[PDB]
Amino acid sequence: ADMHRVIKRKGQESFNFGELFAYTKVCSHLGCPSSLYEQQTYRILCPCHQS
Amino acid sequence: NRPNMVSVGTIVWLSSELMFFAGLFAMYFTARAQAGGAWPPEPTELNLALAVPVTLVLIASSFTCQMGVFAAERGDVFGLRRWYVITFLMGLFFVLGQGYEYIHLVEHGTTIPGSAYGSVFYLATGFHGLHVIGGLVAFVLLLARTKMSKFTPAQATAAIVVSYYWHFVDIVWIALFATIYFVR
Amino acid sequence: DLPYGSALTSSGRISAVTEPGELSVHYPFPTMDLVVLDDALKYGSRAAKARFAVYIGPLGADTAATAREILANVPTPENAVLLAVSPDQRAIEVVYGADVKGRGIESAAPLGVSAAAASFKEGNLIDGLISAVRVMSAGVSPA
Amino acid sequence: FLFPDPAVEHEALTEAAHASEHKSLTALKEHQDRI
Amino acid sequence: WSDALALGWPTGITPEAKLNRELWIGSVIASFAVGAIVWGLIFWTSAFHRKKATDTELPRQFGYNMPLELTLTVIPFLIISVLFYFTVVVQERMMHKDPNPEVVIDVTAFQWNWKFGYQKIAFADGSFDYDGADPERKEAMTSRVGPIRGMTPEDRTYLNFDKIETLGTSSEIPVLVLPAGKRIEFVLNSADVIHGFWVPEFLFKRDVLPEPKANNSDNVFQVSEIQQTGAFVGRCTEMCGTFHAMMNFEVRVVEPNDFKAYIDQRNAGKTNAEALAAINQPPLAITTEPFESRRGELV
Amino acid sequence: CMNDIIALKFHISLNATTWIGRIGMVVLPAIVYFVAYRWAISLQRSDREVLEHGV
Amino acid sequence: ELEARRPFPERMGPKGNLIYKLITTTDHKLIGIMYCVVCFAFFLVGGLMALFMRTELAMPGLQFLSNEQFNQLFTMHGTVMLLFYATPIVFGFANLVLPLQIGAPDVAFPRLNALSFWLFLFGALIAIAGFITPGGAADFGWTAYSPLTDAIHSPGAGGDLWIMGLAVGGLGTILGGVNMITTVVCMRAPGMTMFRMPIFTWNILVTSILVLIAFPILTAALFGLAADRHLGAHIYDPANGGVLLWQHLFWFFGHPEVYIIALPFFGIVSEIFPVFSRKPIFGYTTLIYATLAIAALSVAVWAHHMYATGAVLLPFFSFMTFLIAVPTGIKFFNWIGTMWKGQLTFETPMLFSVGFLITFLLGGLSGVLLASPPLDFHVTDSYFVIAHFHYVLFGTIVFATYAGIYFWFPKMTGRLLDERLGKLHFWLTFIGFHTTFLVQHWLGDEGMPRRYADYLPTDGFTTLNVISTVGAFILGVSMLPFVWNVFKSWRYGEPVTVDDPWGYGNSLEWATSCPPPRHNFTELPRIRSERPAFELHYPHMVERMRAEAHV
Amino acid sequence: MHIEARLFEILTAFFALAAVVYAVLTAMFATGGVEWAGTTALVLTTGLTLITGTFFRFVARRLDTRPEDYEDAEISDGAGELGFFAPHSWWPILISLSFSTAAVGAALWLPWLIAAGVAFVITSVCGLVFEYYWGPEKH
Amino acid sequence: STALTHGLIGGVPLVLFAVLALIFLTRKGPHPDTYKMSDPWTHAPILWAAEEPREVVIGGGASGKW
Ligand code: HEA
Ligand code: HEA
Ligand SMILES: CCCCCCCCCCCCCCCC(=O)OC[C@H](C)OC(=O)CCCCCCCC[C@@H](C)CCCCCCCC
Ligand SMILES: CCCCCCCCCCCCCC(=O)O[C@H](COC(=O)CCCCCCCCCCC)COP(=O)(O)O
Ligand SMILES: CCCCCCCCCCCCC
Ligand SMILES: CCCCCCCCCCCCC
Ligand SMILES: CCCCCCCCCCCCC
Ligand SMILES: CCCCCCCCCCCCC
Ligand SMILES: CCCCCCCCCCCCC
Ligand code: FES
Ligand SMILES: [Ca+2]
Ligand SMILES: [Cu+2]
Ligand SMILES: [Cu+2]
Ligand SMILES: [Cu+2]
Ligand SMILES: [Mg+2]
Structure with missing residues (x-):
């Protein structure tokens, strides 16, 4: 039901297999595992500095 | 030739603190009227073999406190210290005896979450026990102050009002003990 | 001889009153001009360690003997610099005590008289007092 | 804490304490006055 | 005019409501008279006792008029004694309960909708009897030692269950259907917190409590009859949480034969809306409509 | 640094704690500077009072 | 007889004047x-x-x-x-x-x-x-x-x-x-x-x-x-x-x-009325008795807040609540008697006390209506109750609070609040209050319950709600002149160099300076009545005060 | 100070009558019988005024007339020392901050914060009670 | 309406404020009028002094006229 809200990044429009998406678990800020995945807000929270 | 100002303030505050226990007595009597015939309900088995001696120790602490007051009014700081140390030890014994009763009541299934009777029993007796602990703190603070300067009339007034508080705590306990352990 | 509603108390103080809605002070000048003059007095006196004073009223016929009489009413008058003005007689007087002599007041007191007189000819009484106090205190040293 | 000492002991002790405190204050005062 | 003096009170649709409205109008007139006197005394002294320009001495310094002081404690006592007498009369008439009501309604309030059950119908002329209690479901709530007289706080046995029930929904206002001219009895119970049963045209409301008997509340009240057909809004009048403003209901008053037809339809498996359409009534509430479930205009 | 622990224990939004820290990082030192300056001068005046009038 | 003064009193204390005082x-x-x-x-x-x-x-x-x-x-x-x-x-x-x-x-x-x-x-x-x-x-x-x-x-x-x-x-x-x-x-x-x-x-x-x-x-x-x-x-x-x-x-x-x-x-208001009437307070002893009776009765009427719970003994609380109305009316008669045959001047404290009288009267009449359980069966939990308690609260803790502030601000600060700005403040407050709260009686009677975030367009409530909101925003702007007045008057207000700026004060605070010294009194007068400052400032009147005291 | 005692005795008379009347009127023809909460509250309000009034009445019959109890007392009758009145203290705000710490701890149910707040309260109350009794430092 | 509702709520308070402030704040307050030099000095004589420095041989003086 949430697939109509997905915005694709340029060059990455076909990187998902249907409704499966894969991102790096390494945070781009300072490298902590950014792995606090909120399924309803669809928000990925990094525990280290709150990105 | 004039009222003791600290005395009147202490008496006025103690009369107010009677209304705080009024609220808890109201809670107890409301729960008792809704008991439906079983009060205290199972499995609560109150035992007077331990409540009575603890009550008597708390009553005798009033006489020891009054003896300390007589020494203070006499100007005798050492007699005041001796009687207030005895009173402190007896009130501490009351607190420990109550805690032992609490421990034996909890093991047999009378707890605050467990039943309405447990809720009222523990709020009533536990807030009274907190008042007792506050009075013991008051004894400790007063006794330390008598070592700080010479024994003046203001120091004796402080002893007297601490005793007013202790007598209030003892009388409230007599009322709570009568309504819980005999007017069941 | 006391005003209406005024009483002499057991300490000697006077306990007075005002009719409701009336004022206690009623100087014929605007409040902010009075504040400016008060600041001029305070910060001129602080900067010179000499008490500056201002008189408005009738100065008599000699007007310098009267001014010397008024200077006795300033606190610590030996260290004070009074500027007395008669709007009616159109007279300007400056009188100071002995503690201030030799500290720059002989140069500055006539400058204060000139500063007051320049503003008085425009009909600005409080402005003249403020200007004169400013010039005279700027010319006195705490010596 | 519970029992008083003999009054003569208390008097001697209090007098000695006051004398010592006064002597200490005087020593500091006279050093200050000298320098 | 009685409407201006009633101050927005509805005219009323039961005899008890009409009696209450008469008490209201009389009391309003008494209070307006006292207020006019006191306001006029305030305005008089403010108008005519102001300080003139030609008075030098202070006014006469009186501070005690004992007969007047005594006379001004007796009169208000008399007025409140009269008001107390009539108050007692009207509350005795309004709280009166007959041993034989002709419709007994179970009112169940919850957070945050209504359920109306038809417990019993006994028309006074013998033309309609119906026994609606469903005691085979009150027993299913028994929860059982227990913290309160052997019971857990999830006991719920005090609630009433009936065969014909109108259940409110966030998308359907519950419509309670009643016959005109008949003694109606309302039995009020709450599933959780305290709600309020207010039909303004009844000129009366009562609080809806969880476990009313243990709280010494009389959760039962009657109207001797409802004197006209129509549709009347009802609202919750005790703060009950988030949707306290959004749990309204409606009372549809119909003629007794139509009420019998409606009850036959409901017994035949019809829902409330289709059973109302079967007696040529609007199927949904007409005094109120459901609230939008969107949380506001910014959503 | 303990904003996440404080958010969990003291019921503050984590986003709010970040913004409180961001704004307070400018505002709190200014307030503290002003208050500490006035408080120090106030203690100086309290000393002066005892010097003119005694204890 | 030349006493040196300052041209204007000091606006504020120096740096460090206040902050350590506040905490000690x-x-x-x-x-x-x-x-x-x-x-x-x-x-x-x-x-x-x-x-x-x-x-x-x-x-x-x-x-x-x-x-x-x-x-x-x-x-x-x-x-x-x-x-x-x-x-x-x-x-x-x-x-x-x-x-x-x-x-x-x-x-x-x-x-x-x-x-x-x-x-x-x-x-x-x-x-x-x-x-x-x-x-x-x-x-x-x-x-x-x-x-x-x-x-x-x-x-x-x-x-x-x-x-x-x-x-x-x-x-x-x-x-x-x-x-x-x-x-x-x-x-x-x-x-x-x-x-x-x-x-x-x-x-x-x-x-x-x-x-x-x-x-x-x-x-x-x-x-x-x-x-x-x-x-x-x-x-x-x-x-x-x-x-x-x-x-x-x-x-x-x-x-x-x-x-x-x-x-x-x-x-x-019992303090303020006699000063601006130039009269004694009417029935001093009866006012004290009325206060005591109200206090005694206010502990025995609580369940008039519980009429619609169906679980309180209605006649007891109804009768006790009706009884409270008697001493309050005695207070209303005592205050009007204090004003009666005075020399009224209507400075800001007096104006706010009169606003008290007028507003509280309607509040108390509404409360008496509420005291009867039948009428409360319809109006409880509605905006009628809201209108009642805002009429009765706003009278005591807004009009009488502002009266106390305007009255005692010179005593506590040595400066007068501006009376023109005070009159603007009063009339904004008085007009705004009645605009926001009078129509709520009608709304509650119609059927609008208290504590609703929302209603429907078909409820018939919109126009009176709009009127009430217009009044509320008048009450919002009524606050600006008062706050401005205090802010300006605290530093630049008219200096008070007398003990009694209102002329005919009676209590001992008017027999001391504005502001009082640290220990409040450099002397005390002989105390022989409840108007000691008045007798201090007008000795010639003492005889009259004893002669004329009884009608 | 006979008027001071009389005030509380008059309140006591009214409160005792109200308590008895309420208990008897709710025991008879009130659903459930005695209303226990209101009866208890009225009885102990009576007790409050009784404690204070009895204390005042006992104090009054001890000491003879004070200058504030005397209808034609002179101001000079009250000459002399009044008593001790603390000139300043920062301990009250510390006590309130401590009690507020313990209260926030109880609100959010953080037992360690409650413990810290109670310790703060005891230290602050000791600071207040000892403020005018600590002797000079000893070296 | 909805524009009329916002016009009343915003507009009535400000109009009323302006009207009441024209009625009350344009009156003359109790402060005395400012003395004009052309008029005689009919006030009581005034002596003002600074309170600093915090606490009778003349040292001289000067004279002037305007
Ligand atoms: C005791 C005093 C008191 C006072 C003075 C007031 C003041 C006001 N109150 Fe009332 N109110 C109560 C006590 C009081 N209140 C109580 C007990 C309730 C019941 C609560 C409950 O239901 O549980 C209640 C509830 C209540 C309701 C019913 C709400 C509901 O049931 O849904 C309403 C409805 O309109 C109302 C409105 C007002 C208004 C418009 C004012 C006007 O005075 C206010 C306008 C005033 C202002 C002062 C505006 C602010 C002005 C500014 C300039 C602010 C700008 C700057 C800053 C804020 C920093 N309040
Ligand atoms: C200042 C605050 C204040 C004051 C003084 C009062 C005073 C009174 N109040 Fe009220 N009241 C509140 C604040 C106040 N109240 C609040 C905040 C609530 C709501 C609580 C809540 O639910 O949120 C409330 C609610 C409340 C209720 C419950 C209503 C309900 O929720 O259903 C009742 C009912 O009995 C009541 C009545 C009275 C009466 C009879 C007086 C009397 O004391 C007034 C007596 C005064 C007069 C009568 C006027 C003067 C008399 C005369 C001039 C003589 C005239 C003679 C006759 C009429 C015989 N008020
Ligand atoms: C300055 C702190 C407060 C500023 C923030 C509020 C400043 C106050 C003015 C604007 C807030 C309300 C106007 C806007 C209303 C709104 O639409 O909601 C906005 C937001 C979406 O909702 C909120 O809930 C806002 C927070 C509520 C205020 C909590 C009170 C905090 C306690 C303080 C009083 C403690 C003392 C002050 C502490 C002072 C500094 C400490 C050193
Ligand atoms: C808690 C200890 C229990 C001891 C049993 C007997 C009770 C009486 C003890 C008398 C203490 C005398 C202390 C004294 O004079 O020293 C004083 C110094 O102690 C203090 O000032 C602080 C005392 C501790 C405060 C209490 C905090 C917590 C209270 C616990 C509540 C249970 C005298 O000092 P000084 O001679 O003036 O240098
Ligand atoms: C329902 C039977 C009545 C029970 C009486 C309870 C009264 C308890 C009072 C205790 C007071 C003891 C000092
Ligand atoms: C639809 C007719 C409305 C009539 C309203 C009556 C006015 C009430 C008087 C207000 C109270 C004045 C203090
Ligand atoms: C004692 C109650 C007085 C209530 C008066 C209410 C008047 C409101 C007028 C509004 C009219 C709307 C149609
Ligand atoms: C000072 C006046 C305040 C009172 C305002 C009364 C408004 C009543 C308007 C009624 C509107 C009719 C629907
Ligand atoms: C018919 C029984 C009612 C008896 C009255 C009870 C009085 C309440 C007592 C209060 C207890 C204080 C400890
Ligand atoms: S490492 Fe992810 S926010 Fe810093
Ligand atoms: Ca809206
Ligand atoms: Cu509800
Ligand atoms: Cu609700
Ligand atoms: Cu009430
Ligand atoms: Mg209600």
């Missing part, structure tokens, strides 16, 4: 000023809450608030206005003048007095801090009915913060009551007998006795509620009798509460 002061005058400032800040906060509610009620539909936020808004608006503005401002006024009125240098317990103020401030901050949590503040109403307040139905931290903040502030209030009672019984000046004290002091003493009854039982009820919410206790369990247990305990507090914030302000 045992001076009741400074503590009273601190009370007034902080209570007024809380008044502005609570008024902002009401402005939000009123804006949302202007139109049907939810334009910017949710249900939850609206419920928090009325809960906290009522809490802030009742317990963080009115109740502590009683003790603000008492700290300002009560030691002066009895000719004392101080209160009985200066450090306990300071502690009472700091407990007020920090308890209020604890309760308001619910708004910085994600869920928000308490949203179960200021009355906090059970079981809505239990952990099942109000789980958030806002409710618990509300409970504990109320407990802390209530301890502050109780200690303030102890202090005020002890001060009156111990610190009176020689010749200041109990029946020579001003009516304000009598009302403070009786109010303090009421405080000692109401606030401890509310503290006990709150601690029972916290036991239920944190320990799983069954105090307020419905099957246990807890619904009406809560209501009985709360209202046994809650009725005494409304008269704790009525009698002091009655005493304020």
